[PDB]
C-alpha cells in the first residue's frame, strides 16, 4: 500500500496511472489492497466517462459528414467498406475502454455502483454499432 501511494508520488498524467493499474491489476484482487484504492477509482471512472462521451459525440456526426469518409476515399478505400471500418474502429475503442473500466474497478465491475451505467451504455452502444445491415444492403 505504501508503494501504491508512491504511485501518485511518481505518476503525473492519467495515462501513466492507467498503465500502473493495468500492470498491477491482479494485485487488487486482494481485499485490503482493493479497499486501499478508493478515491482514484472515481477519478479514472469519470475520465473514462468523458472519453466514452467523446466517442458518443464522434458517433453522433454521421459517417459521410465526417472526415473519415473523405480520407477513406482519398486512400482508395470504398465508401461502404469505409463506413464498415469506421464502425469497427468505434467498436474496438468501446471494447478497449470497457477493458480499462474492468482493470480500474477490478473483476465484478458490471455490478459496481459506477460500472452498471457504463455496462448498460456499452451494451446499447455496441448494439447500435452493428454493421450487418450495411453489408446486407450493399450485397442486395
Amino acid at each position: 500500500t505504501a508503494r501504491l501511494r508512491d504511485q501518485l508520488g511518481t505518476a503525473k498524467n492519467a495515462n501513466e496511472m492507467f498503465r500502473i493499474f493495468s500492470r498491477f491489476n491482479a494485485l487488487f484482487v486482494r481485499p485490503h489492497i482493493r479497499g486501499a484504492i478508493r478515491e482514484y477509482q472515481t477519478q479514472l471512472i469519470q475520465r473514462v466517462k468523458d472519453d466514452i462521451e467523446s466517442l458518443h459525440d464522434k458517433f453522433k456526426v454521421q459517417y459521410p459528414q465526417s472526415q473519415a469518409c473523405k480520407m477513406s476515399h482519398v486512400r482508395d478505400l470504398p465508401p461502404v467498406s469505409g463506413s464498415i471500418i469506421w464502425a469497427k474502429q468505434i467498436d474496438r475503442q468501446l471494447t478497449a475502454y470497457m477493458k480499462r473500466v474492468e482493470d480500474v474497478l477490478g473483476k465484478g465491475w458490471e455490478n459496481h455502483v459506477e460500472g452498471q451505467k457504463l455496462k448498460q451504455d456499452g451494451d446499447s452502444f455496441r448494439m447500435k454499432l452493428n454493421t450487418q445491415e450495411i453489408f446486407d444492403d450493399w450485397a442486395r
Binding site: 500500500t1 481485499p31 485490503h32 479497499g35 486501499a36 478508493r38 465484478g108 455490478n111 459496481h112 455502483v113
Partner: protein, 358 residues
Amino acid sequence: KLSLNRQFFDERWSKHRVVSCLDWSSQYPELLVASYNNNEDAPHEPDGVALVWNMKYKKTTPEYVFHCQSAVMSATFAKFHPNLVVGGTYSGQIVLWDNRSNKRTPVQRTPLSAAAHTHPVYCVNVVGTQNAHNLISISTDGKICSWSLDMLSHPQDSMELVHKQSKAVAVTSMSFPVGDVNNFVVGSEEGSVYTACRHGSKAGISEMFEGHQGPITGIHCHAAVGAVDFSHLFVTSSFDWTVKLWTTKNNKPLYSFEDNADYVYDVMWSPTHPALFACVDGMGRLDLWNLNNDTEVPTASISVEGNPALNRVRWTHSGREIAVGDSEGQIVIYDVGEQIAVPRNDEWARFGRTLAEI
C-alpha cells in the same frame, strides 16, 4: 436539566408516520437522519421515507428527502462515504440513497433472493476503517450479511445466526464495541441478548443471556472511551418495562431498572460521560440516568407535549443534545446541561466504584 432546543416536523412527508431509527453523522454532526414507515392514511404516497434535517440552519424544512416502495425501519449514514445514506426496509432490500443525485428513489437495492434478505431488516451499520469498511445488515430471520457499499448486488459475506438446536434468532437490534470489528452483540425478540463473532472459526453466536422476559426493543454498547475501559458493558431495553445494564463477562444481569410504568422503547449510552445514559418509553418520558449520581432514580426526566409514544432516541457525538422520535413523526431535540453531560476527571473512577459496589 433538559432544555428544548429544536423541533422538526414536515406536514407533507412526516405526517401520520412513526419514527423507526435516528442517526447522527460523524462527518456532519449537525445532520440528523430519521426514518418513517408506511402511512395507512396515505396509501397513494410512498411507503418508506427517510428525511435528513439540519441544525446549523434554523430553517424548518427537511434538508434532504428520500423515499422508497418498502416501509423503511432503519436508516443511517455511511461513515466513510458522506454522500450516501443506507436504509433497511420492510422486504429486506438494503436501499442506498445518494444526496448528489436528483432522484429520490434508491440508486441501488439488494435483491429479494435467498442469498440476500427476504425478511424485514431493523439493523444496518457500517463498520471498519476508511481503507476497509463493510455494511453489516441483520434481518428478523437471523440472517446476517456483510456487504460492500460500492456493490450491493450480492453480499461479500453472509450466513444465518443460530445459537442452540439450530433455532432461528430473530434479531431486533445490534451494537458493536468501539474500535472492534470482529465481535458484536444482538438483541432479539426472544428476550435473550447474544454476543457473537462476525468472521472466524467461531463465527456466530458465542454466548446466551437469559435476562429479559419479553421482546427486546433496543440494545447499545458503551460508546465513551477514556481512562477506564468500559467497552465490555452494554445496555438493553425490552417490552417488559425494564432497562438492563449488563456486561459481556457476566452471563447474569448486573443491574435492572424498572422505574418506568410502560413499554421502555429504547436505551442509549452517552458518548462522552461514561456513566450517564438515557432511555425513552411509551408514555412520553425521556429519562436520563446518571449511575455515578444515582442508580436509584432518573437523574433527569422530561415529557413531550401531549405525551405520545416515544419510539426511538439518539445521542449526538458531543453528548450535549438528544433527539427523540415518536409515533406521529414528531422529532424533538433536547439540549443537555453542562453539569450532567460533561464528565469531570473523576467520573470514570466513580463509575468504576459504582460497578464494583453493585
